[PDB]
Structures are given as structure tokens and as C-alpha cells.
Design an enzyme around this catalytic site. Sequence first.
Site, PDB file in Angstrom:
ATOM      1  CD  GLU A  92      -3.012  -1.291   2.106  1.00  0.00           C
ATOM      2  OE1 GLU A  92      -2.991  -0.519   3.085  1.00  0.00           O
ATOM      3  OE2 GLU A  92      -3.708  -2.332   2.028  1.00  0.00           O
TER       4      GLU A  92
ATOM      5  CG  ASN B 101       0.712  -7.437  -1.927  1.00  0.00           C
ATOM      6  OD1 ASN B 101      -0.497  -7.670  -2.020  1.00  0.00           O
ATOM      7  ND2 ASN B 101       1.675  -8.271  -2.304  1.00  0.00           N
TER       8      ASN B 101
ATOM      9  CG  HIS C 138     -10.216  -6.044  -1.285  1.00  0.00           C
ATOM     10  ND1 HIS C 138     -10.578  -7.065  -0.419  1.00  0.00           N
ATOM     11  CD2 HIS C 138      -8.955  -5.684  -0.949  1.00  0.00           C
ATOM     12  CE1 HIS C 138      -9.590  -7.305   0.417  1.00  0.00           C
ATOM     13  NE2 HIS C 138      -8.587  -6.465   0.115  1.00  0.00           N
TER      14      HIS C 138
ATOM     15  CD  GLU D  22      -5.543  -8.383   1.536  1.00  0.00           C
ATOM     16  OE1 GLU D  22      -6.483  -7.558   1.723  1.00  0.00           O
ATOM     17  OE2 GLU D  22      -4.322  -8.086   1.569  1.00  0.00           O
TER      18      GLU D  22
ATOM     19  CG  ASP E   5     -14.077  -9.889  -0.306  1.00  0.00           C
ATOM     20  OD1 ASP E   5     -14.893 -10.858  -0.189  1.00  0.00           O
ATOM     21  OD2 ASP E   5     -14.312  -8.712   0.057  1.00  0.00           O
TER      22      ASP E   5
END
Length: 316
Positions: free
Chosen positions: A146, A187, A224, A253, A255
Site C-alpha cells: 500500500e 502489494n 477486492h 486477498e 474478495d
Amino acid sequence: NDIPDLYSVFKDYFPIGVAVDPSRLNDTDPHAQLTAKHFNMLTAENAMKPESLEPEEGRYNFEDADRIVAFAEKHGMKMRGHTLVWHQQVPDWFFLDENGNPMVDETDPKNREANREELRQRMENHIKTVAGRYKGKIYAWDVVNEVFNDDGTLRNSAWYQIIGPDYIEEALRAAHEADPNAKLFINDYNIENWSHAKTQAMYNMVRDFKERGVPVDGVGMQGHISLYYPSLEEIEKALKAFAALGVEIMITELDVNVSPDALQEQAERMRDLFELFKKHSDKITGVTFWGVAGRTNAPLLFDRNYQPKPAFWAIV
């Protein structure tokens, strides 16, 4: 057991991962059985975040992280380390000066130059210690996470204010030196859509690294993602673009965030995405499901009672 092993379905495409809690890792526990049955890649949900590993200056606690890694060793899963450098879940001590004041608040040019040096040391020491401990056991390190604002400007975190833009390259070299065997990832979220400013900032930075010799192996797309957006087309151009730089891609991740119609819609989007991932399996070296949602560590796939959900049957 009669249902298929998820990770086997994806053999010779890419590993399939899940993030775990170190409490849930006993043979007594069906969670641990579900993990070992379905997944061949593992990440620490929190045990390897900066605040978990180094609560105080020079004080380390490796208990939970070690348990997670040992779990991966036993079942021969690829281990992702998450994450070496981040603006969240990072103890305040990291960024305090000699007197114990926010380093950020310093105005004097000579003292700032001294703060810069201490933070570089602190960052590198953390890296050497952690990657050093797990040397050879880690498939991929999330070295930084990030680093971008959503507009594609670098995040004005403490790391950035004090070290300036170099901290990133510096984290990557220090990681590379500590464990040359580990794949090094950068990431982020909101970098799935090729047309997004963020995704482009990340491309520019990574491209820059590859051309300047800065070691970086992979970009971690958090994934996401919604039902209708971004479009498969938009995601595809992103995979193509980074793969053209010679960096790998992981979905870290994944989702696709109540009713009976709700479930079937999410299962079809997942089908679609996995189709697209398979299409580009040469560019993708791992897909890990988000799992904090008590719900399982893969809430998309298995119900609170460990039964397959719609999404699971959609992708197998």
C-alpha cells in the site's frame, strides 16, 4: 472426503492460498483440516505484520509467526510473508526521534538527515531479522504494501516523509540481500483495473525498478473486486501490462463482497474471474482468498460449518 481438493483443481495454473490465525492450527481443529485439504499456499493474517513482530524497539516475538510457518512446512505449502514494511499495524516507536517526539515534526535540516539515517537502519534491521529468521522458507515476501495513494501519488506515510521515495527500493534490496530465494512482491489494492490511475502509478514504479536493476519479482493485487466492476477486460490489460515488465502477479486477498440470489451472483463472478486467471495462468503465481469475515478463513468458499458454498462449486 468426497468433495474435490481446491488446490488440485488449479494444479499447473497456480497455487491457491488462505490467510490463517495461529490459534486455528491444531489437528483437533477442522479449520486446520480444511486448510490442509484445500490450499497449498499460506499467509499469516496478522502474525508477521510489523506491530506483531517488533512491538518495541529491538524486541521481537516470533511465536505465532513460527507456528504458521511450521504449519506450512508440515503440509508442504508455499509460505507468503506479509508484510515487511507498511504504514498500518506498525508500532509508533518506529517513527520517534531521540527525545521521543514524532520524527515527522522535525524542521531542522541537520537533525532530519539524522532521523532519516536512524529510520533506514530500523527498516533494514527489521527486514534482516525477520527475513533472516525465515531464510529459505518463504515463497514470497510482501516487502511493501500500500505504498500508493488512490490517485497514484506515493502515500505520504512516515516512511515516505522521513526516508523520502527511496525507502521502497531500499526495502527491496535489503529483503533481497537477506533472502535471495524469496520472491519479492509489492502489494496493493485498487490496482486490478488497467484504466485506474493507481494501477498506472504502480506500473510506472515497477517498470522503473525493472529497468534500473532494483530487485522486484512480483506485483500483489489485493483483488477486492465487485460484481460488475472492474470488467474482465480491464483486469486483463493490467495482467498483460505487468507481465510485459517481466514481473509475476499474485491475487493476495481475493474478495467479491446475503440472500439465495446474492450467493449465486457472487459465484458466477468468481467463475468468470477464475476463467480469466486461468487464461493468464502464466502471469499469475498465486491466488489467496481474503478471510477475516464465526466465518471460515475462506468465507467465499466454505460455510460456517465447513460446507462448500455456491462459489466453490462454481470454480471447481
